[PDB]
């Protein structure tokens, strides 16, 4: 198994998958790594059990349809894995935990967001479609971008929107287009 955490690509206290070499920090993992359970599967390797045993959820999907599936245990472990590829990225540091907004010509957003807070969310199973846990990922960047304006900081909301975005597309296998 690996020695650094799949997450935060450090070392420390690391739960190793049974079926794969990935490891993680107890609270890296999303869901936080299970007390028992021997073997352990992790949950890139829960996702690919999906796709396995139904190649066919494979093909293309439009994003309106995949919106409105209600949360049942697949969804919410796809949600989970998306929320876990944007903290993979460095760059989720800076959406992580709770802002503030205090800066000359700028007012605060309405609905502020975080990714913790998405976090608690779905493990309290408050989002019932998938539609819910999307708008508040979404929300998170668009805030950003609106606060930040024109400095050149607003780029951090664009590059890990785009991995947000990129990891969407790949999990929930949305149609390619042009
Ligand atoms: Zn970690
Ligand atoms: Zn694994
Ligand atoms: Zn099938």
Redesign the pocket.
């Known amino acids: 198994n690996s020695n650094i955490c799949e997450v935060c690509n450090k070392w420390g206290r690391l739960f190793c998958?049974?079926?794969?070499?990935?490891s993680f920090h107890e609270h890296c993992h999303i869901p936080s790594v299970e007390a028992n359970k021997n073997p352990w599967?992790?949950?890139?390797?829960?996702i690919?059990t999906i796709q396995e045993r139904c190649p066919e959820s494979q093909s293309g999907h439009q994003e309106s349809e995949v919106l409105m599936r209600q949360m049942l245990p697949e969804e919410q472990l796809k949600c989970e894995f998306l929320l876990l590829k944007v903290y993979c990225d460095s760059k989720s540091c800076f959406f992580a935990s709770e802002p503030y907004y205090n800066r000359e010509g700028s007012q605060g957003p309405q609905k502020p967001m975080w990714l913790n807070k998405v976090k608690t969310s779905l493990n309290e199973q408050m989002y019932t479609r998938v539609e819910g846990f999307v708008q508040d990922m979404r929300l998170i960047f668009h805030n950003h971008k609106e606060f930040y304006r024109e400095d050149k900081f607003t780029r951090l909301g664009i590059q890990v929107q785009d991995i947000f975005e990129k990891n969407f597309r790949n999990i929930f296998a949305i149609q390619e287009t042009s």
């Open positions: 998958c049974d079926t794969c070499p990935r599967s992790c949950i890139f390797c829960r690919k």
